[PDB]
PDB file of C-alpha atoms and ligand atoms in Angstrom:
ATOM      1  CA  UNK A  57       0.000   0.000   0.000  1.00 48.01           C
ATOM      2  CA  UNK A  58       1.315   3.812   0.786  1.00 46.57           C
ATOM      3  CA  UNK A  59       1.937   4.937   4.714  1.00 44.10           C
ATOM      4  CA  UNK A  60      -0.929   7.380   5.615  1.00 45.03           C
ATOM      5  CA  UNK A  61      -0.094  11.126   5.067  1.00 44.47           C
ATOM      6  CA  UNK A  62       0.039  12.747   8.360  1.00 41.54           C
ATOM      7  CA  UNK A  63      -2.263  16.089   8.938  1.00 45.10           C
ATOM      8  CA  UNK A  64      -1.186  19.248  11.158  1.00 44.57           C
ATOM      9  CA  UNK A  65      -2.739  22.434  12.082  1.00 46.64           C
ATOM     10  CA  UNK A  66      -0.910  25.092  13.929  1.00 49.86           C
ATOM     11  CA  UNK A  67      -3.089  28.141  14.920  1.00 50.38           C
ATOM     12  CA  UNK A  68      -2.901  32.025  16.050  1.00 49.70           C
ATOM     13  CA  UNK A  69      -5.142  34.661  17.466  1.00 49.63           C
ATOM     14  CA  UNK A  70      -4.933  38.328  18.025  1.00 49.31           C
ATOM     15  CA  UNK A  71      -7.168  40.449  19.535  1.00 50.87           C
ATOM     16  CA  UNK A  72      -7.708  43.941  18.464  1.00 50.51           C
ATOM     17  CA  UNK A  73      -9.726  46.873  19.354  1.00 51.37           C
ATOM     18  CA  UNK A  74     -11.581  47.255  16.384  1.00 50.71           C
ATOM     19  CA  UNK A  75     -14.697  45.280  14.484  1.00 47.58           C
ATOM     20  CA  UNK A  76     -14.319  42.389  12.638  1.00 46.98           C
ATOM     21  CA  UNK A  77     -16.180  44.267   9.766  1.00 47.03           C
ATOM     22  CA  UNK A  78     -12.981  46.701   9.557  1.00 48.66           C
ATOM     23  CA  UNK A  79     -10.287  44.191   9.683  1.00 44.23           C
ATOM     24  CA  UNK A  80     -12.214  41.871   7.287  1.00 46.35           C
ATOM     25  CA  UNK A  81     -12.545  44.488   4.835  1.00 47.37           C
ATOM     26  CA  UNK A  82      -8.820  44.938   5.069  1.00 46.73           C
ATOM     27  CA  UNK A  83      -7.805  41.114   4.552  1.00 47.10           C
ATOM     28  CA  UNK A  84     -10.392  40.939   1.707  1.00 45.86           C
ATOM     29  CA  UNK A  85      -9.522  44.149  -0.288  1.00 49.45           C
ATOM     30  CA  UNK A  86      -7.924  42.890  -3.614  1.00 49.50           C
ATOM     31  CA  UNK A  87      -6.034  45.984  -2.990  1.00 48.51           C
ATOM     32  CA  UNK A  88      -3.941  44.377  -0.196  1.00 50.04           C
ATOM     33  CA  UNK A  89      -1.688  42.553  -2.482  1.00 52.84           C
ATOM     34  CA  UNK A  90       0.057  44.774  -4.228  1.00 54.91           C
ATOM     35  CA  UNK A  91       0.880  46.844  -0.532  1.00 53.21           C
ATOM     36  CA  UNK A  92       2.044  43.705   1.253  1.00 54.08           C
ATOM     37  CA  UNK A  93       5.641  45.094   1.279  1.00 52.28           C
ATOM     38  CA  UNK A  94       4.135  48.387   2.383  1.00 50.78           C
ATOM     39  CA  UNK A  95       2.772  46.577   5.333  1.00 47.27           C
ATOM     40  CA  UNK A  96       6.170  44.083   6.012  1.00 45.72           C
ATOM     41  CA  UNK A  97       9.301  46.502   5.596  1.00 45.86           C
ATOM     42  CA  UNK A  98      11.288  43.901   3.931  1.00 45.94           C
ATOM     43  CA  UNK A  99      10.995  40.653   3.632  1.00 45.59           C
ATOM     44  CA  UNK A 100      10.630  40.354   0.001  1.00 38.41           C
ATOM     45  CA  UNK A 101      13.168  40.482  -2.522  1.00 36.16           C
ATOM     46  CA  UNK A 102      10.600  39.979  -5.027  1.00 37.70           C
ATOM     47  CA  UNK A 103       6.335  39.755  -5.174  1.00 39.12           C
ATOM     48  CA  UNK A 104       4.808  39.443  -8.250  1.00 44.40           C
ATOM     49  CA  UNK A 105       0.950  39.520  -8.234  1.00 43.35           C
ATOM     50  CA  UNK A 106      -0.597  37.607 -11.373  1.00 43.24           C
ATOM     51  CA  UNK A 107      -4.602  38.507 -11.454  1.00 43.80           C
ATOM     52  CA  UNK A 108      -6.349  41.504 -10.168  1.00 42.86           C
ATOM     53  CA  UNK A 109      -5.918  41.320  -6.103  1.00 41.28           C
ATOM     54  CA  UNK A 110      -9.367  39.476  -5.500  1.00 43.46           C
ATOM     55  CA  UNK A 111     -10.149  35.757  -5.156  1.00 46.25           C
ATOM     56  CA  UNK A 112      -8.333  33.730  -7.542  1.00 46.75           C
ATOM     57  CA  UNK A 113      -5.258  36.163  -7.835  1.00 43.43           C
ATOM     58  CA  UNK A 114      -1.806  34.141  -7.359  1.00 42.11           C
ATOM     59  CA  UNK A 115       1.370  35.849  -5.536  1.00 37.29           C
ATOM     60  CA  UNK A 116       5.007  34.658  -6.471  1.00 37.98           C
ATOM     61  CA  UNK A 117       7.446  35.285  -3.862  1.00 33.10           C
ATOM     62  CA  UNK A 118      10.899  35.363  -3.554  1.00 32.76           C
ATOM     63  CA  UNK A 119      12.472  35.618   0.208  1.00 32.15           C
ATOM     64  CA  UNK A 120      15.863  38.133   1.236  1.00 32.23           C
ATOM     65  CA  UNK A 121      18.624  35.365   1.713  1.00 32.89           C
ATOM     66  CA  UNK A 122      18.687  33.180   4.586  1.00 31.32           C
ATOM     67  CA  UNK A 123      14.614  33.085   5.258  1.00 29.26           C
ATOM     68  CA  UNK A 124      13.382  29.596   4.681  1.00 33.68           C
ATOM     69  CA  UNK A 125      11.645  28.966   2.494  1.00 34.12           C
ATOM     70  CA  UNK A 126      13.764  31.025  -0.214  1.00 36.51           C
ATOM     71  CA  UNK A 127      10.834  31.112  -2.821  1.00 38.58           C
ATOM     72  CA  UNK A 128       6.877  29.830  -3.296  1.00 39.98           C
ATOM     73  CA  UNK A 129       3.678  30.673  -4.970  1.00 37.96           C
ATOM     74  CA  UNK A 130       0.717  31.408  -3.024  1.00 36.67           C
ATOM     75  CA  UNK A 131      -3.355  31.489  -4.235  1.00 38.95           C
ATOM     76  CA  UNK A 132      -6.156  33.650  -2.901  1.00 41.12           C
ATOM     77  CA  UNK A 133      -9.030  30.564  -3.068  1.00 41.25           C
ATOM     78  CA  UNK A 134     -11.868  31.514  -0.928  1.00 41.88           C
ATOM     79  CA  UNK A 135     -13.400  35.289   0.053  1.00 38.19           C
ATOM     80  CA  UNK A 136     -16.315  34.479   2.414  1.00 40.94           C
ATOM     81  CA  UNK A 137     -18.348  37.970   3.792  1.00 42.34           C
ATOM     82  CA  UNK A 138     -21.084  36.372   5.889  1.00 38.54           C
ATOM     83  CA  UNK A 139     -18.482  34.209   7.939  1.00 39.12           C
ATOM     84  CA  UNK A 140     -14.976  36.634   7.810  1.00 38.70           C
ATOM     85  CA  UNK A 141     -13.296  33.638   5.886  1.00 40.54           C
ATOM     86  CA  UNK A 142     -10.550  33.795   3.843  1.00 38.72           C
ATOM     87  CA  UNK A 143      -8.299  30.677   2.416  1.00 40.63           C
ATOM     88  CA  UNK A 144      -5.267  30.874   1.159  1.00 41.69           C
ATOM     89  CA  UNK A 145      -3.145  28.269  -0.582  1.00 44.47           C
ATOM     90  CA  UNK A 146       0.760  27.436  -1.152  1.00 44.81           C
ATOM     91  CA  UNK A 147       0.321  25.891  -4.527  1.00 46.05           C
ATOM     92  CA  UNK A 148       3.977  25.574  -5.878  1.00 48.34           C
ATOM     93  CA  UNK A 149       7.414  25.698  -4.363  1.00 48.63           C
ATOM     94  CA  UNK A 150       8.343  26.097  -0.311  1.00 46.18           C
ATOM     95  CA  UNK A 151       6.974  23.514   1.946  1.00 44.68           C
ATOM     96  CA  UNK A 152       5.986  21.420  -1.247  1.00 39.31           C
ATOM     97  CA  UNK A 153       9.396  21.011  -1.960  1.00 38.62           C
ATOM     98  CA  UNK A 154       9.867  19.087   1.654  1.00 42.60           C
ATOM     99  CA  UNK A 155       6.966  16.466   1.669  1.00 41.45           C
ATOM    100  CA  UNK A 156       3.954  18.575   2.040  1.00 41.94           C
ATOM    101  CA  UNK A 157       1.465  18.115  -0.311  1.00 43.92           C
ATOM    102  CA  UNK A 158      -1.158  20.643   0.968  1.00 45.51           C
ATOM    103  CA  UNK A 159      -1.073  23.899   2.660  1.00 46.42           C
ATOM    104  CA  UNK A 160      -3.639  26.067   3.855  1.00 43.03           C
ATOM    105  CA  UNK A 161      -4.105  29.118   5.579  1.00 46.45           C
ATOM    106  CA  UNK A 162      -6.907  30.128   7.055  1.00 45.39           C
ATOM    107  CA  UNK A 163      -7.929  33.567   8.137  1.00 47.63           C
ATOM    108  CA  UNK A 164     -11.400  33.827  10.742  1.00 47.31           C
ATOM    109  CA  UNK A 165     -12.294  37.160  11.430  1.00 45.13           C
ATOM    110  CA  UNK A 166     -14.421  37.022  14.476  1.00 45.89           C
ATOM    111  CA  UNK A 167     -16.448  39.541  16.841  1.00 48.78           C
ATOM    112  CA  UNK A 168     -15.355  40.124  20.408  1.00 48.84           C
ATOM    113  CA  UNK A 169     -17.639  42.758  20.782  1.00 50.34           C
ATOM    114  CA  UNK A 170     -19.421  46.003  19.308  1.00 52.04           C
ATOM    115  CA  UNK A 171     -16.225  47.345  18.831  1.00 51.48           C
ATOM    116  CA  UNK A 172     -13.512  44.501  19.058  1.00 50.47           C
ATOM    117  CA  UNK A 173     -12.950  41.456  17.196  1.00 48.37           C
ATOM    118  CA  UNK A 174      -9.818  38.221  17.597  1.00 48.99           C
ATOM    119  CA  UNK A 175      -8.152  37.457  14.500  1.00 50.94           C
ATOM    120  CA  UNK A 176      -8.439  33.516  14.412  1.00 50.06           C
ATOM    121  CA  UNK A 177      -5.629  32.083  11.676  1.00 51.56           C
ATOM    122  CA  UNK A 178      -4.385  28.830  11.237  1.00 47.41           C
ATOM    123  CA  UNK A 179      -1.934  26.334   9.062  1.00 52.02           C
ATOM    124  CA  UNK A 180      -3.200  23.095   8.190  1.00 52.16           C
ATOM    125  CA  UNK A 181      -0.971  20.740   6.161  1.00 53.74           C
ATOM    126  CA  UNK A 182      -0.234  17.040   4.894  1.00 49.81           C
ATOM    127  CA  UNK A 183       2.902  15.534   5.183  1.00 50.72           C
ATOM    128  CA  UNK A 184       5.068  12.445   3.859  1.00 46.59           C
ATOM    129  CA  UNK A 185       5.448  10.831   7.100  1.00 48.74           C
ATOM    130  CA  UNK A 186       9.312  10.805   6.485  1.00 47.92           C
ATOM    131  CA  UNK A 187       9.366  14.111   6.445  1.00 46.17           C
ATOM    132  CA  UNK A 188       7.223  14.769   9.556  1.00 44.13           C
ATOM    133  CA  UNK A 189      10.516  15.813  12.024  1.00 43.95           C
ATOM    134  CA  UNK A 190      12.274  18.069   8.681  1.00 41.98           C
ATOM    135  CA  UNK A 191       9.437  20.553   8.494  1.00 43.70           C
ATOM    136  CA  UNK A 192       7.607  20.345  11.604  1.00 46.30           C
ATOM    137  CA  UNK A 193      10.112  23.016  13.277  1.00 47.56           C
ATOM    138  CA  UNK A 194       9.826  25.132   9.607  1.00 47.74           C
ATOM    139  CA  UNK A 195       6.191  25.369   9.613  1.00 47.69           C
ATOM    140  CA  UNK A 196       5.468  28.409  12.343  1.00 50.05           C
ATOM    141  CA  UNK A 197       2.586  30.932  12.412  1.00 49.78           C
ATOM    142  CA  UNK A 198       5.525  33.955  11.875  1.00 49.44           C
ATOM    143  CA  UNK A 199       4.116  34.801   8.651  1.00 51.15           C
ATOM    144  CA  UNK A 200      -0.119  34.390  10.107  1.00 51.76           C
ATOM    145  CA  UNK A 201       1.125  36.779  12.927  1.00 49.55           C
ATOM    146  CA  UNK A 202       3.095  39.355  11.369  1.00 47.92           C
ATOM    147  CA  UNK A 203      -0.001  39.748   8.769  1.00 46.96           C
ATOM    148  CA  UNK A 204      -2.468  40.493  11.576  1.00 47.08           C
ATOM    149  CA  UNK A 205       0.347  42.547  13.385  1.00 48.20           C
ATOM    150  CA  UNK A 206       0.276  44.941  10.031  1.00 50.83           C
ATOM    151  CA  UNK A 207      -3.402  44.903   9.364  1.00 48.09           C
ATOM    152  CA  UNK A 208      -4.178  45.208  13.366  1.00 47.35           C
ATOM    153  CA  UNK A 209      -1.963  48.353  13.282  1.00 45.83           C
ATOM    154  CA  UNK A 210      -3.131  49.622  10.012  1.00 47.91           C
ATOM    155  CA  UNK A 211      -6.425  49.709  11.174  1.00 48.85           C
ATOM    156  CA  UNK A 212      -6.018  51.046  14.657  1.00 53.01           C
ATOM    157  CA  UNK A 213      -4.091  53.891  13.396  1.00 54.07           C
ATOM    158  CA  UNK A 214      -6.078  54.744  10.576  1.00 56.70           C
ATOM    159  CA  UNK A 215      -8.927  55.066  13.250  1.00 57.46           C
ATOM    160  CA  UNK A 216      -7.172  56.731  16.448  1.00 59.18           C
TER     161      UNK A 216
HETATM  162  C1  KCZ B  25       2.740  36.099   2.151  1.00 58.19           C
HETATM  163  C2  KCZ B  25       2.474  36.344   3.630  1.00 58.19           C
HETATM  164  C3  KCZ B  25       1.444  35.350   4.174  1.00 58.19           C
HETATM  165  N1  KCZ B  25       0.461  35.070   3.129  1.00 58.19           N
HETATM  166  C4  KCZ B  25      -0.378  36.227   2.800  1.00 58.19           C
HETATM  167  C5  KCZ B  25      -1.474  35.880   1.809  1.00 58.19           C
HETATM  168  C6  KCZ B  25      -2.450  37.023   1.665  1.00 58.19           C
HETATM  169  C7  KCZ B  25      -2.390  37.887   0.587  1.00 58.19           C
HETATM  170  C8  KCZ B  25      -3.271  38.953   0.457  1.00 58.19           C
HETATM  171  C9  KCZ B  25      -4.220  39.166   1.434  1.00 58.19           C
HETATM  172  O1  KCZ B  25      -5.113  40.190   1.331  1.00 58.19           O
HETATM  173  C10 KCZ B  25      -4.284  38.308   2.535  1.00 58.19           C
HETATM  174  O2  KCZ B  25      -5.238  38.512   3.491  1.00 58.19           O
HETATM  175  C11 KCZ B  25      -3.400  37.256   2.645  1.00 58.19           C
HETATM  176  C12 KCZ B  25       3.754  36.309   4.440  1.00 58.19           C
HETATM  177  C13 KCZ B  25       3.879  37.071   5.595  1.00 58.19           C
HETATM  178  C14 KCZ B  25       5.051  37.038   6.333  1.00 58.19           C
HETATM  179  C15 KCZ B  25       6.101  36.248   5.929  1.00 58.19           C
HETATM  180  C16 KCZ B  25       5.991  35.489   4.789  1.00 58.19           C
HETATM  181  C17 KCZ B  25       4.824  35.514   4.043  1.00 58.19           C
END
């Protein structure tokens, strides 16, 4: 036969003094894109955007030396407004280079209040069970938390 795949979700939440409408309209404008530099100083040697921003857009990034992974492509796949919901997906290079054969992230936009909300994201991938031990220190929620760090700010400040 083939060894099961093994499955693991890593997860993140920030709170922030501001409603989930704002943020979500943030993480959902097909403007964000194009400013992701703007809102991580570096990071990115390179970022080109291939579609218009919205669902269905795909990012190609290339990483500053050193930062693993070096390269990957990423896809807007799902835009949800009723729920806060958005999916994005690592469709070529990175992690899939190391025995993961999916990767997801999920963003959950969620009321705390009025006037507050908790930015719920999470990771889930499949993984070669060989490679398990190789990328289970790689795979972090850095990048999940230093989006919401940006658009948390962005949004506070462009309020206070
Ligand atoms: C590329 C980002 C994480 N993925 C970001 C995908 C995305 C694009 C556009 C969006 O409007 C959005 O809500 C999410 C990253 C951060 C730090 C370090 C490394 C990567």
């Amino acid at each position: 036969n083939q060894v099961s795949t093994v499955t693991k979700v890593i997860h993140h939440e920030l709170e922030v003094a501001a409603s989930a409408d704002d943020i979500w309209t943030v993480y959902s404008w097909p403007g964000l894109a194009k400013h992701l530099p703007d809102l991580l100083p570096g990071a990115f040697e390179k970022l080109e955007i291939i579609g218009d921003g919205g669902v269905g857009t795909i990012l190609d990034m290339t990483f500053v030396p050193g930062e693993f992974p070096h390269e990957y492509k990423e896809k807007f796949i799902l835009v949800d407004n009723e729920h806060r919901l958005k999916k994005v997906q690592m469709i070529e290079g990175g992690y899939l280079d190391l025995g993961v054969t999916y990767y997801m992230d999920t963003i959950h936009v969620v009321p705390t209040g009025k006037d507050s909300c908790v930015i719920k994201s999470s990771t889930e991938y499949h993984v070669k069970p060989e490679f398990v031990k190789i990328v289970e220190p790689l795979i972090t929620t850095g990048p999940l938390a230093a989006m919401a760090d940006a658009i948390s700010k962005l949004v506070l400040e462009h309020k206070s």
